[PDB]
Every structure is written in structure tokens, then in C-alpha cells.
Amino acid sequence: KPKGALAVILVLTLTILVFWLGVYAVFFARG
């Protein structure tokens, strides 16, 4: 199993998710 690659795509996932959920929260605050 490519454990290293998996780490990377995990970081990429959390980044997207913090970015996306973050700005979603902000959209509703400003709505």
C-alpha cells in the first residue's frame, strides 16, 4: 500500500474540506 501518497491525498482532502466548509459557513453568516 502506497502509504505516502495516501498521506498526501489526506492532506489535500482536509485542505479542500476546511476551505469549502469554511467559506460555506461564511456565506451563511453573510446571507
Binding site: 502506497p2 505516502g4 491525498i9
Partner: protein, 551 residues
């Protein structure tokens, strides 16, 4: 040099490369200033003593984007995406055309540069009507871009010639990327060519009194999304088919590389509205479609992330690395040609993340036209693409010129690369954050220093980024000029092979993906279906309005 007599493509490629960096340097000179501006520090007085022809923040901003994001990025793409396919197939590019395209590029640039430098075209690299620039700007820009049409033909030629010599063999990897790349660009480019010809040129010439802002914008964005993928893919081609070697490993999948590239041909163009989420007169259903199709275009880079990461870990394990982190420290971090793209890839994580936000319809309302967007795109183009382009100095230049890279010069390269990376991460933080605080993009904000009190923290990052990047820039100029203007020549470098990686299996997919005429038309249908309905309604209800010059 007998090397050029037999490989004349090296010389034309070199020319594309040098002009590209010359444009990058000149364009970038304006960046630190802008960075300090977004940190509420006004260093424009100083810049104007140094470069007296500069009349305003906005003329520098016009130069910065045009030179950096249009000129350099295009010249890079042309260098890479002609020379690389040519070396893989071991064939001569049509040299007549290869020089025509360079001269087209050079002359168009020269022509655009005149009104640009004379303060007659301080629109931005987006030149939205009714802001009306000098005809020379539209003409010189038009000619510059059309240069790529010759590139398209050149690679199409090579491709077919090979295919004739080799019926019922699939397209070699690099060449397949280059072919789907250049065809994608051909579809993509029709928006701008259309805009320039039917509207911009006649308008700047005195031929029509007005232009229709919304149609102009709609046509513009037809092209200017795919243009970013046009910037991105020369970098990827390297990251896929060269970097794996530079890392000490192999590309982990040829099919995966082909598929990523395939998806870019299909999905790079039919997306442009994601720049027009805040425009009037475009149906919201069509915005939602473009939104969904944009999320789809994230797929190939999502795929890329895994393929490439795995290729990195693979090389990392092959070199002794063990653990979950072992493979990372195992990699050749002393090699600038390895470091620049990988650092660029790291930044691409937050970069793509911000893109995905931008794409999501309503979420765009949070960030549109704020500092967030530059934040996003510095991570994508100014970092990943630029850094990939940078690292190739250390493999490509010696290949093209036979000029050696000293250890000293290798060291300075690591520095430039790193300082440039960090500086971009730092500015990326200041911009995104300032953006979240509603700080508008494209603004000489330092000239209204009391406007944005809440932004004081991200501002410090912007200043820091400013200086750190000025240093990187300075060092980059000095490093490039040491290596171009150096004394020694070892033509055995100019004759070495390029460091293409080997691949470590699904023939049937590969054969499918090789049906290129087919995928090309699928792409073209997708563009008709995505843009046709809206463009039809638009052309049927034109409302031309007079031009303005407000600088």
C-alpha cells in the same frame, strides 16, 4: 556548432525560453511593489524614480499580468510542448513554421509593448470594455496569441508524420499529451479570436462606436479559463514524464497520465461562466451547469495529485526511504530541478482548494473580486507553473545550449526556488485572509490607508512576502544571467538525452484514448452545448456602448 545544424529545434526552443524569462523578469519587477501595496505600504514613489515611464499603480498592474500571465506562460508552453514531443519521437519540427511562430510571438509582443509602456493601454490583462485601449495593444496581443495556432499545426504535423511511419501503434506518451493539449487550446482560443476580430479590433480602429460589455466578457472567458490549463499542462507534462526520473524513480502509470490529459481536452473550455457568476443577463441554470462542469475539471488534477504523489513515494522508497515520512527525506532535495516542481505541487494543495471554493456558484459571492482570487492564482500560476519553469533551467538549458551548471549555480538555484516558494506561500496567506475581510483585488489600497483597518494582520504577511520575493527575484536575475552569459561550453551536454522517466496494464483504454479525432469532436460538441444557447441569445440582443479611457 554542428549540434544546431542537426538539431535546429534546440535554438528555436531556446529563443522561446529566453524571451519567456525576459518577460517574466520585467513583469515580476512590479510584483514586490504590488505586494507592499497589499500590505498597506506605498513604495510607488521609489518605483517611479527607478522606472520613470510608469505613471500609475494600474499601468504596472497591466504590465505585470500581461507579461507574466500571458507572455511568459505562453512562451513556456510553446518551448516545452513543441520540443518535448519532438525529442520523444526523435523527429525534426517543421523549422520554417517554428521560426515563423517565434517571430509572430516576438513582433506581437513588441507591438503590444509600445502603447503599454506609453500609458495607452492601461486596461488590465483582461481589457474589459468599455475601458478602451490602443489598437496596437489589441493587434499586438492578437498576433502574439495566434502564434500558438502555428504551434498547433507544427505538433499536428509531427504527430501525423509519425503515425504514417507507424500505423497501428498508439501515440507515445509525451506526444499524446502535446496533441490533446494543442487541440484543447485550439477550441479554447476561438472565444478570444472571436472577441478580438468581431469586436475589439474594429472598435479600437474606429470602425464601430461601441462594444457590448457582456458579450465581450462572455467570449473572453470562453478562452481565459482554458488558458490557465494551457499554462498548467506544460508543467504537468514535465511533472509526469521528467520529474519521476529527476526524483530517482519512474512514472507509476502511463494510462493514468493519458487519462488526466484526456479529461483536460474535454473539460477545460465549457466552463467559463465560473468567471461570470456575478454578471447580469446570464441565466442561473447555465451558471449551475458551468459550476458542475467546473467541479468536474478538478478531477484530472485530483487524479494527478495521487499519480504524482505515488510516483514520488515510489522514487523515495527506491532510494532507501522507510516509514510514512521516510520516502520524503530520501528524495534528491539537493537538486533544484527536483525541488522546484515539488514545492510548486505543495502550494497547489491550497491552490486547488481555493479554486474549488471559487467554482461553487453561490460561494463565489463571498470571494469574487477580493484579494482571495490573486491568493488562489499566485499559488497556481506564479508558483507551480513558474517554479516548474524555473527548475528546467537546471536540466533544459544545458540540454539546449550545452552550457554547464556549476555547483555554485546549483546552490543559488535551490535558494531562489525556496525563497520564491515561501514568499508565495506567505503572500497566499495575506491575500486569502485579506480577501475574506472584503479587500478588493486590483486596488491601490495603500493610497487609501485608512479603508481596511481590520486587515492589519494579513497586511504584514503581504509586506513580508513583498521583500522575500524581491530578494528571490533579484537572485533569480543574477542566477539566470550567470548561467546564460557563462564562459564554458561542453557540447556533450547539448547531446545528452533529456531525463525522461520510464514507466513501471490496460491496452484497451489506451487504444480508446488514442481515438483522438473522436474525443476532439466530443470536446467541440460540449463547447457548442455549453456556450451555444447563451451566445445565441446574446448576439440576438446586442447593446453596444461607448468606450472610455479613465487613466
Amino acid at each position: 556548432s554542428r549540434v544546431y545544424e542537426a538539431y535546429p529545434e534546440k535554438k528555436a526552443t531556446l529563443y522561446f525560453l529566453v524571451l519567456g524569462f525576459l518577460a517574466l523578469i520585467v513583469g515580476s519587477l512590479f510584483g514586490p511593489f504590488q505586494a507592499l501595496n497589499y500590505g498597506n505600504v506605498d513604495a510607488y514613489p521609489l518605483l517611479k524614480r527607478l522606472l520613470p515611464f510608469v505613471q500609475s499603480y494600474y499601468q504596472g498592474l497591466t504590465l505585470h499580468g500581461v507579461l507574466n500571465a500571458i507572455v511568459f506562460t505562453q512562451l513556456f508552453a510553446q518551448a516545452i510542448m513543441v520540443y518535448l514531443p519532438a525529442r520523444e519521437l526523435n523527429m525534426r519540427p517543421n523549422m520554417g513554421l517554428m521560426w515563423l511562430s517565434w517571430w509572430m510571438a516576438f513582433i506581437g509582443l513588441v507591438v503590444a509593448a509600445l502603447p503599454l509602456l506609453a500609458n495607452e493601454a492601461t486596461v488590465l490583462y483582461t481589457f474589459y470594455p468599455p475601458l478602451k485601449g490602443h489598437w496596437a495593444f489589441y493587434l499586438g496581443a492578437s498576433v502574439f496569441v495566434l502564434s500558438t495556432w502555428v504551434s498547433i499545426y507544427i505538433v499536428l504535423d509531427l504527430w501525423r508524420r509519425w503515425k504514417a511511419a507507424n500505423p497501428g501503434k498508439v501515440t507515445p506518451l509525451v506526444t499524446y499529451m502535446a496533441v490533446v493539449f494543442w487541440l484543447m487550446w485550439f477550441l479554447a482560443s476561438l472565444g478570444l479570436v472571436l472577441e478580438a476580430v468581431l469586436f475589439l479590433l474594429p472598435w479600437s480602429f474606429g470602425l464601430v462606436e461601441g462594444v457590448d460589455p457582456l458579450v465581450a466578457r462572455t467570449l473572453f472567458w470562453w478562452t481565459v479559463h482554458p488558458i490557465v490549463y494551457f499554462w498548467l499542462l506544460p508543467a504537468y507534462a514535465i511533472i509526469y514524464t521528467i520529474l519521476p526520473k529527476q526524483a530517482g524513480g519512474k512514472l507509476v502509470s502511463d494510462p493514468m497520465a493519458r487519462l488526466a490529459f484526456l479529461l483536460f481536452l474535454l473539460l477545460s473550455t465549457p466552463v467559463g461562466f465560473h468567471h461570470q457568476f456575478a454578471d447580469p443577463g446570464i441565466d442561473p441554470t447555465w451558471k449551475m451547469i458551468h459550476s458542475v462542469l467546473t467541479l468536474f475539471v478538478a478531477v484530472p488534477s485530483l487524479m494527478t495529485a495521487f499519480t504524482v504523489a505515488a510516483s514520488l513515494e515510489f522514487a523515495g522508497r527506491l532510494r532507501g526511504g522507510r516509514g510514512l515520512f521516510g520516502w520524503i527525506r530520501a528524495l534528491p532535495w539537493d537538486n533544484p530541478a527536483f525541488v522546484a516542481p515539488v514545492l510548486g505541487l505543495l502550494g497547489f494543495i491550497p491552490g486547488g482548494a481555493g479554486g474549488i471554493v471559487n467554482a461553487s456558484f453561490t460561494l463565489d459571492y463571498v470571494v469574487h473580486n477580493t484579494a482571495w482570487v490573486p491568493g488562489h492564482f499566485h499559488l497556481q500560476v506564479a508558483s507551480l507553473v513558474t517554479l516548474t519553469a524555473m527548475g528546467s533551467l537546471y536540466w533544459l538549458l544545458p540540454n539546449l545550449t550545452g552550457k554547464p551548471i556549476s555547483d555554485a549555480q546549483r546552490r543559488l538555484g535551490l535558494a531562489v526556488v525556496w525563497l520564491w516558494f515561501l514568499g508565495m506561500m506567505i503572500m497566499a496567506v495575506g491575500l486569502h485572509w485579506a480577501g475574506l475581510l472584503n479587500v478588493p483585488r486590483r486596488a491601490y489600497i495603500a493610497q487609501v490607508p485608512d479603508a481596511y483597518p481590520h486587515a492589519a494582520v494579513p497586511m504584514v504577511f503581504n509586506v513580508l512576502a513583498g521583500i522575500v520575493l524581491l530578494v528571490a527575484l533579484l537572485l533569480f536575475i543574477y542566477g539566470l544571467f550567470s548561467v546564460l552569459l557563462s564562459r564554458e561550453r561542453k557540447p556533450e551536454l547539448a547531446e545528452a538525452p533529456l531525463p525522461f522517466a520510464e514507466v513501471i496494464e490496460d491496452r484497451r483504454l489506451v487504444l480508446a484514448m488514442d481515438r483522438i479525432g473522436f474525443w476532439f469532436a466530443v470536446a467541440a460538441i460540449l463547447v457548442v452545448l455549453a456556450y451555444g444557447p447563451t451566445l445565441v441569445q446574446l448576439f440576438g440582443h446586442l447593446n453596444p456602448v461607448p468606450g472610455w479611457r479613465l487613466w
